[PDB]
């Protein structure tokens, strides 16, 4: 189950 | 504040350089310094803050999961537990730092829906990361703190943003993951993901080509979870 | 020594856990603590030390290259140079730490060819990383320190190990890269890579299936460089 | 031009 990756601006 | 002698604009510039160099601990420290200047953050600056800490805590969480798995297998010397505890304490420290920035004083100064929803979503996320490692006495209180932050963000986002707004979509995605993974409420997770996806799809017709791309990207993540959960 | 209160065997155990968790800074600190116990390192422990620091310095080098490239483009505020300098100083500090462990007192206690060649190769590698960022007054002396360490390692390895020995092969590979990238001697790099490859190929018939796999893996890296250089 | 990767024990 994936949350927002959110690792790249 | 170790960043107290650097200009706000220089901290922001260096956070962008640190992202390009994949130096996420540096990025986070630069963005912490920028927040501590006391001014509100722009949309771009909020994204830099979030990206920096998400990478830092993402590395800690991945390491914690590796060590916790080794530890659990060993329970079927003290070193595995000791090292898991060290990583756990470090992770809790980063979450507490983020939560402290949100509490002093990002959230209280955030009056627009976009900023307030963004920060309350972060608050929910960082309590959720604390909940992933929490065991006793305050695990329930940590979970309720995550729930409360996500719920306030959801209430504002439903009143103030269109259903395709990417922050509204990512908030719903992450709250659904909270329901599934933390709160032991898979039906609530599925219902939230389905309703979010359907209301977004019905609103896509209003969007430009670039906004359509932004919204459908996150909608696919909702669909990916629903495929996994059903 | 911040690791001074932890048992040697616990430091080694935790270095292995840190590798599994991809916590390479922790790995390096654990292995530094183990070296500082004062006992010689086994073959496996030498590999742990090398892997830990190679990952740490590899991240720094990649970041330094990103920032140096941005800086050079900007020379076609002070922030890019300032941040490149910070990363550079950090990288130099890690190289100096590794070189200090080799000098106090890993190399002087290493009597067997396998250990002495391993440590002298590391010494050459870490001077090579210093050379990659060095500019003035001591750049020549840094380069000569790398050359001298690699040369002593090569002399021992040619007398004491078969041409297929993986440490002998990796030493030759890295010395050839030194010639190509640092010493501006591409013909020497090519000649070393060719001779190393040919003498290894002629010795493969003596090896078990597992040793054959180990040696041919590194031979392919030599061939990859030769393809790039010719 | 690649040196020994050397990132995995
Ligand atoms: C929480 C969140 C959801 C969606 C997006 N987005 O669409 O980019 C963001 O921004 S970011 C660049 O941090 O992933 C955050
Ligand atoms: C310098 C070097 C060359 C070759 C090898 N090897 O064959 O594994 C090593 O060991 S390691 C596991 O650090 O790459 C080192
Ligand atoms: Ca405000
Ligand atoms: Ca000895
Ligand atoms: Cl100012
Ligand atoms: Cl002891």
């Amino acid at each position: 189950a994936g949350s927002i990756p959110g690792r790249r601006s | 504040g170790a960043m107290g002698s650097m200009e706000r604009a220089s901290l922001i510039q260096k956070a962008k350089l640190a992202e390009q160099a994949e130096r996420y601990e540096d990025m986070a420290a630069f963005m912490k310094g920028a927040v501590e200047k006391g001014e509100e953050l722009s949309c771009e600056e909020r994204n830099l803050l979030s990206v920096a800490y998400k990478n830092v805590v993402g590395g800690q969480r991945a390491a914690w999961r590796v060590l916790s798995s080794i530890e659990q297998k060993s329970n079927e010397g003290p070193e595995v537990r000791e090292y898991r505890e060290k990583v756990e304490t470090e992770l809790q420290g980063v979450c507490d730092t983020v939560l402290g920035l949100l509490d002093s004083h990002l959230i209280k100064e955030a009056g627009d829906a976009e900023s307030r929803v963004f920060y309350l979503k972060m608050k929910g996320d960082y309590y959720r990361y604390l909940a992933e490692v929490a065991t006793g006495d305050d695990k329930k209180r940590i979970i309720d703190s995550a729930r409360s932050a996500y719920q306030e963000a959801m209430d504002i986002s439903k009143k103030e943003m269109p259903p395709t707004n990417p922050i509204r979509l990512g908030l719903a995605l992450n709250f659904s993951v909270f329901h599934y993974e933390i709160a032991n409420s898979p039906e609530e997770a599925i219902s939230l993901a389905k309703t979010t996806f359907d209301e977004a799809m019905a609103d896509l017709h209003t969007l430009s080509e670039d906004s359509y791309k932004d919204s459908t990207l996150i909608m696919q993540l909702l669909r990916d979870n629903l495929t996994l959960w059903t």
Side-chain angles (χ1 to χ4, degrees), chain A residues 1-7 9, chain B residues 1-72 74-75 77-136 139-158 160-212 214-230:
Chain A
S3 60
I4 295 263
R7 305 290 211 73
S9 73
Chain B
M3 290 306 168
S5 67
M6 206 184 303
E7 288 275 17
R8 190 184 187 280
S10 299
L11 290 165
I12 296 299
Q13 188 177 351
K14 290 184 186 174
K16 289 167 195 193
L17 294 171
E19 181 176 25
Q20 294 177 90
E22 292 179 8
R23 296 264 299 193
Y24 293 106
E25 281 185 351
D26 285 353
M27 209 171 163
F30 289 138
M31 288 307 308
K32 179 176 185 286
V35 168
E36 289 173 353
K37 299 300 177 179
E39 305 267 29
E40 301 187 23
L41 300 196
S42 71
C43 177
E44 178 171 10
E45 295 163 354
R46 294 192 292 272
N47 283 319
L48 290 170
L49 177 71
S50 179
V51 165
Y53 278 108
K54 183 87 64 213
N55 272 279
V56 172
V57 84
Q60 296 171 318
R61 287 163 76 206
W64 185 94
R65 292 190 295 267
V66 167
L67 299 171
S68 183
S69 171
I70 297 170
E71 186 182 10
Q72 279 159 0
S74 78
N75 296 331
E79 287 86 357
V80 179
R81 171 187 55 76
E82 282 169 354
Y83 187 42
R84 189 268 299 154
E85 298 178 326
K86 179 197 171 169
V87 171
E88 181 171 305
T89 299
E90 194 189 281
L91 179 165
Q92 293 167 324
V94 173
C95 293
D96 289 342
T97 290
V98 173
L99 293 166
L101 296 173
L102 295 167
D103 200 45
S104 301
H105 299 273
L106 289 172
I107 288 171
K108 76 174 45 76
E109 290 311 335
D112 292 356
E114 313 97 83
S115 60
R116 191 168 190 82
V117 171
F118 191 94
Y119 292 137
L120 288 168
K121 176 186 168 179
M122 311 181 50
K123 181 172 184 176
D125 285 343
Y126 287 86
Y127 275 114
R128 170 163 58 89
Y129 306 150
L130 289 178
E132 288 178 337
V133 308
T135 49
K139 204 222 172 163
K140 289 181 174 165
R141 265 179 288 262
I142 308 168
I143 290 176
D144 194 63
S145 286
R147 180 209 56 74
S148 186
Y150 283 136
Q151 187 58 244
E152 190 188 335
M154 285 283 300
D155 296 342
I156 299 165
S157 75
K158 281 190 235 133
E160 302 298 340
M161 311 145 162
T164 47
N165 177 280
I167 291 323
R168 178 170 169 182
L169 290 176
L171 163 67
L173 177 72
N174 283 12
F175 197 15
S176 75
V177 169
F178 167 83
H179 287 306
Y180 196 92
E181 294 189 358
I182 308 298
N184 194 24
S185 304
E187 298 184 323
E188 186 72 12
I190 289 162
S191 169
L192 177 56
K194 278 188 190 302
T195 290
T196 300
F197 183 98
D198 285 348
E199 295 173 11
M201 192 183 39
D203 193 70
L204 291 175
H205 70 93
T206 69
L207 301 183
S208 70
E209 171 180 34
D210 289 336
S211 291
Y212 182 90
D214 291 339
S215 297
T216 56
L217 186 90
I218 304 169
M219 287 169 69
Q220 177 72 234
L221 305 178
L222 288 162
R223 207 73 227 171
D224 287 345
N225 284 345
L226 283 167
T227 300
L228 198 52
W229 295 340
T230 68

